[PDB]
Design a protein around this ligand. Structure first.
Ligand SMILES: N[C@@H](Cc1ccccc1)C(=O)O
Ligand SMILES: N[C@@H](Cc1ccccc1)C(=O)O
Ligand SMILES: N[C@@H](Cc1ccccc1)C(=O)O
Ligand SMILES: N[C@@H](Cc1ccccc1)C(=O)O
Ligand SMILES: [Cl-]
Ligand SMILES: [Cl-]
Ligand SMILES: [Cl-]
Ligand SMILES: [Mn+2]
Ligand SMILES: [Mn+2]
Ligand SMILES: [Mn+2]
Ligand SMILES: [Mn+2]
Lengths: 348, 345, 346, 346
């Protein structure tokens, strides 16, 4: 050439996203939602720092692919949230995407129509809409943040947030966490590395900068204040790491690092060895721990839907199309089991 | 009750990419150097050419004057060894860290906690343009999904670091970077995350970023066919023939390019800069014997050797310790001679 | 350091960008067909290819979307009724420029209380414009600035540049890039030269500054607008009569631009008296019956209820210039249709 | 789906936001001081708190920054020499509006070749404006649209709204938020009322659409500009003489706005003849000697070299309106200095 091309050589298309502010204008957080979010955050902070011995329970589908079923799930769960409010602090898992190495559906935000149309403007509007409806009905929500831009669209509706095993060591994700309004859980690494999560809590506690967009949708540098409400999530690795031996080892490491030694345990994913029928075993092991001692457990995580298992196409209502989940009946047993176990712990 | 930006001190709009692009447009010559160098590196990744890519330079740039002088010296050697080595300057603006400390030239250019990013972005672009204009291609690590909009048009080779190789969004980024991309193996030696990254990054993805004009955007990528692995050590170093052979088998097994890069520094030197030469000597011996799966090396080098906590000495690192200029001359002559023998078979 | 920037500015507030409104209110297929078709139909009148009369008719200003829609439903019946003689397009002006303090219109101040809720005002304007086209009623508007068109010009079948801006270079540059045909009003005191010059200017390629659909400062490069014409709206004295029309047509021909024009029955032509709009229309009818070859359109200020009021108390009654009511509007349209039917039969 | 959007648009491209230019060319302390003081000094003249004569003087249009700066160096000596009698501010206008095709000025088309490199034009305009303020020469300009002021109004000590836009509502809204004092020109044909009306309007709070310094669609809420005044530039006939000044003053007083005004020596007051600016100046000088209490300023079109040329071949000679040369400028300023020196004895 004269001028050889060097910009966007491997880019098919860049399209504007509607700014966060457009979504916020259509769907402003209500007074009720605001109160629920503010309260639930403070309450979760109390658990993280050992000021309250109630058990945080992040529970719900692996991924949200159908708002209607999410809203029905929320209705059922709400009754249990209330029933168990003295023993457990129940928050719905509302993740819009499962990260994956191979190609496949990129979730409800990226691809709301489930057909590779990538209608993100729609997806983001749908995602905000659901999160607002959840908070309005009295069901707080949690989610995993996969990038540094989506939080501007709906983090104001999030009571608890996660950074996944594949990004816990990522500098920029730690930076993000240090500025999220909600408490944040850092999952241990894919193969069980706990150190990255312990390091992440220390890092995310401090002030940081990272790049994102303003609510008006423009390139921005963000200066964080630190997030003092971070904690570990044990989700297994090569072997599961839910039992008392592992919880006690993690707590030693946490204390040795001088960060909170209250942690959360995932009943699904690697701790269930990718088998949804084993989540109850994990919970039952956690129940047992809480009865004997369990001083370092502040939370658990469970993959649960209306209907159990999984499907590869979205044919059955309330049935996951990502990781398999325990159905509603087992959800009822699992929660009873945890509430009764924790009732005793709080009394001791 | 407030629920938004509870833990945010400030959100500040940046000058858009178009502003920096207006002040510092890529020149014709620089676009040719970038275009050519990218293809040349693609040829190494895909086994078309047997020159050895050498990504060499400071751990991190904290002073552009010293980087330009470094580049001037390096350029003569890039030219001298062009039939055996494809020399490209390491121009990394930041070293990621867990503890508190300096966040690099882009984030904090004045080295004083002022975080003058607009200036940092300008200075980074300015340096990269100057380097390309003098004949020196540049390489960098991309730590997020927005900075590439400011200066990726000037980068001939990019890296994704050990701590981000497994991150989905960073792989999605890699899938639309105009340059070839190296993925580093995990902090403790995990090669699979890099092998998976190359696979993921060869496909078309979507990720969020900004347009050149600074507006929140969705990016639809075409996939990046020119990705490869970088061996940078783990619990043990992984630079030797035995580790190379195992990585190459796993790469072939995965159906991705089995040509890789070996970092002489970081966890392969185990943070002793004086051990880089020893790693390079082992690499040289591999190239002389066979070394068919090696397409490149990485070396942390500066004008003056070692490191210092404050930028007192000119041309000396304030992040990881580097070999100095004399050792650099020796290492490059060494690798040139060894690869000459490889290429002749 | 002394401050020198924004010294007399209370506030600068970023708006929602056009793309935000366009996403909530995309133009429908049906509204697109109507807009596209009506612009071409008007082009054909402007250039003498069709002899139907363009009738820009409706409220002085829109202050109540409900009444606007009711007005449209009634007007639609007549648009259809007279479609062989008249091309009826609804007047949908959101603001009346004024010199003194007062309401700045439905876009700038939709709540009519000086809250200046512009985001709401732009949304409601777009929404009203979309509902109008969807029911079969094309819309017309005056563009007062260079940024508002990005929010709703896609919904506009005919656009005006008023007496106070016809001579404005930047408004001529705007007109040169508007998707719709454009009418330029003669000056406040009757100056026609500014409108003739405007047509010439607007037919050529220009640049002017605005925003992109995403809301970013932009330079706009236009193709030129071949479908501009003049609008006679009076001055010191009215200029609607055959003798004024005749002279304006000669001056248009001498400038090498279209000698087909529009006559406003209202404003300075009615001497600010809405009960004279019918007399102007009667004079126009008499011209169309005799010859009237240079008339391609008329403008009428019309509402559900006649007159004007200071506060919006009575439903369907103007809060800006006094308009004829619905009954008078039926008579005025019958008169014009009847006169033009005869013109078209020659 | 028929197309309805941007049908007659060739291209919309982003403009660098104001903040990009402000980052590269921040106002200096010195320039901020000069601007601040000069604006204050001019408001004093507008309201008759001081009796020095504002002289807006310089090229019709800027097409070459080098000549502009050279011109400024020469003017600076006389600005200093006459500082007790005259307040000399350089005319730094980047474009002359026109009806026919031709050069669209230094901002729109800095390369004088039809390439419309507007980013470069805005940059060059701000650059020149900053250099002028830094050397000690304050600057004045005409604002043609609602966006360009965001790029350099912080460097402007006096602004003009031209004859073709004085009646424009949006341009009055702009004026009401401009940090400098503003002169409104009488109409093209001599109409003074639009300018008197403009002063009233611009004194109040208004809204208008523009962009934020960051380059995004915005609504601007202004505070009102108390420092507006009329500029008499002729029309149907020259309006520089004592009788016309007296009529204008009476009319200003009746509208309850400042009866201090500016008289343009050029344009229609010179009958388009650059050799008559000295004659107008002489008439003004005789008024200042006798009484001239309503005069607060004059405008003059002046360059290094007299006359005009179609192509920018000769250095320092206008390619728009013909100007007096540097020699006649020296004579014209000495004349006005001496006459106002006498006026100031009363
Ligand atoms: N708005 C986020 C914080 C954030 C700001 C800016 C960018 C990204 C995230 C929260 O309230 O948690
Ligand atoms: N501009 C980048 C690709 C990219 C586009 C958009 C966002 C991020 C990265 C390149 O040429 O490599
Ligand atoms: N979008 C307008 C033209 C326009 C573009 C940009 C700014 C202003 C107006 C139309 O289609 O008529
Ligand atoms: N910045 C201008 C005022 C202004 C603001 C916004 C838009 C246009 C003009 C000044 O200081 O005079
Ligand atoms: Cl934008
Ligand atoms: Cl656009
Ligand atoms: Cl602003
Ligand atoms: Mn899952
Ligand atoms: Mn390093
Ligand atoms: Mn009216
Ligand atoms: Mn002139």
């Amino acid at each position: 050439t004269h001028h050889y091309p060097t910009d966007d050589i491997k880019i098919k298309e860049v399209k504007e996203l509607l700014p966060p502010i457009a979504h916020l204008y259509e769907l402003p957080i209500s007074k009720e939602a605001s109160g629920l979010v503010h309260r639930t955050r403070q309450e979760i902070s109390d658990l993280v720092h050992g000021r309250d011995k109630r058990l945080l329970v992040i529970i719900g589908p692996c991924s949200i692919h159908d708002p209607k079923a999410a809203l029905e799930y929320a209705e059922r769960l709400l009754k249990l949230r209330k029933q168990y409010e003295n023993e457990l602090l129940i928050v719905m898992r509302v993740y819009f995407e499962k990260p994956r190495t191979t190609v496949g559906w990129k979730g409800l935000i990226n691809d709301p129509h489930l057909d590779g149309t990538f209608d993100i403007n729609f997806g983001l509007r749908q995602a905000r809409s659901l999160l607002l409806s959840l908070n309005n009905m009295g069901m707080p929500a949690s989610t995993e943040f996969l990038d540094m831009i989506t939080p501007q669209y709906y983090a104001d509706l999030i009571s608890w947030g996660a950074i996944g095993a594949r990004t816990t060591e990522s500098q920029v994700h730690r930076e993000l966490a240090s500025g999220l309004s909600c408490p944040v859980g850092f999952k241990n690494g894919t193969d069980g590395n706990l150190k990255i999560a312990i390091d992440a809590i220390g890092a995310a506690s401090h002030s940081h900068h990272f790049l994102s967009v303003t609510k008006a949708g423009h390139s921005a540098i963000v200066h964080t204040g630190g997030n003092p409400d971070c904690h570990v999530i044990l989700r297994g690795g090569k072997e599961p790491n839910y039992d008392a031996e592992h919880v006690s080892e993690a707590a030693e490491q946490l204390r040795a690092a001088g960060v909170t030694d209250k942690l959360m345990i995932d009943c699904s994913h690697a701790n269930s060895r990718k088998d949804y029928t084993r989540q109850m075993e994990v919970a039952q092991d956690i129940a047992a721990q809480l009865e004997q001692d369990g001083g370092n457990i502040m939370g658990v995580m469970v993959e649960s839907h209306l209907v159990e298992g999984r499907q590869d196409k979205p044919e059955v209502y309330g049935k996951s199309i990502t990781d398999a989940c325990i159905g509603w009946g087992a959800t009822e047993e699992l929660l009873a089991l945890l509430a009764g176990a924790n009732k005793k712990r709080m009394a001791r």
